[PDB]
Structure 1
Amino acid sequence: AVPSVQTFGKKKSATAVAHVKAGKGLIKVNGSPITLVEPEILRFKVYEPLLLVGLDKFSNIDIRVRVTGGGHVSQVYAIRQAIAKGLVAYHQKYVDEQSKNELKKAFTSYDRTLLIADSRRPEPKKFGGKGARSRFQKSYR
């Protein structure tokens, strides 16, 4: 009756709403930060998308997302690379042109599954076969 659309947008493996909240570099959404995690394993792995690229680099970008889907391991292994792509590529309107060109040329010799976003999607398989690496399960006679 009314042309009321939900602003459906895409993400790595989930849905999103296409209405971003601009701000003054506030990496949070109004009641909770995410970045304070302290895992004791992947610390340098999370510092890699930022510490090698530029320490703060958040004077002109925020992350404003709430999505329920995908997975937790996918979330940790996807959102950091996602904002890395946001800060190195989407910032071409803002960041220095020679700086981003140097960065892309530096990462051309760095694409070793460290600057790759998780493009994984859930898929169902069919009943009748289960094997992946070993053999199947069949009887004699």
Structure 2
Amino acid sequence: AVPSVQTFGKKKSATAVAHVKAGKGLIKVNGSPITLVEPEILRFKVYEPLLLVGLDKFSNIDIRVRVTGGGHVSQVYAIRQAIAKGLVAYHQKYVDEQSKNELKKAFTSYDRTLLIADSRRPEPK
């Protein structure tokens, strides 16, 4: 069986399911490449993981992201969270754990939201 890992990203009602499998850097969102993700203005947000850890690592994997729910902004945040978590999970399972540590450190250095859900749970005062 081809190596594959699965991850979820969530933001408000938006939920994104990412499958990361051995491949050739074929990355798609809802059956289309990333470059067509909308709104255009926030597209680089979805690019945040790709650019941080370098495109070289993605050159050996294919990522399929399927996203449902929420609005535009929450959809984008779900996408980026799903991509980051999937990349780290695959690097853990089928690559050295040293690269796993490097990936986690880079991501948590930039913005921890890529890895931990951002749940603004109510707090009474």
Structure 1 residues without counterparts, runs of 5 or longer = 125-140
Q: Which residue of 1 aligns with 2:20?
A: 20
Q: Contact 1:28 / 1:34 at 8 angstroms: preserved in 2?
A: yes
Q: Which stretch of structure 1 is more off in the superposition, 115-124 or 105-114? A: 115-124
Q: Once superposed, what is the RMSD of the aligned Cα atoms?
A: 7.6
Higher share of residues assigned strand: 2
Q: Contact 2:15 / 2:67 at 8 angstroms: preserved in 1?
A: yes
The alpha carbon displacement at 1:76 in A equals 0.9
Name the CA shift for 1:101/1:75 in 2 (closer, same or farther; >3 Å).
same
The alpha carbon displacement at 1:23 in A equals 5.3
Name the CA shift for 1:6/1:116 in 2 (closer, same or farther; >3 Å).
closer
Name the CA shift for 1:3/1:88 in 2 (closer, same or farther; >3 Å).
closer
Q: Deviations over 1:88-138 (max 9, x none)?
A: 2332122332122123234444445455445589999xxxxxxxxxxxxxx
TM-score (norm 2): 0.55
- Secondary structure at 1:78 match in 2: helix
TM-score (norm 1): 0.51
Structure 2 residues without counterparts, runs of 5 or longer = none
Q: Which stretch of structure 1 is more off in the superposition, 94-103 or 109-118? A: 109-118
Q: Which stretch of structure 1 is more off in the superposition, 104-113 or 19-28? A: 19-28
The alpha carbon displacement at 1:63 in A equals 3.4
Aligned residue pair count: 125
Name the CA shift for 1:91/1:25 in 2 (closer, same or farther; >3 Å).
same
Q: Deviations over 1:2-61 (max 9, x none)?
A: 999999999984678999987544323896334334756435433321111121433444
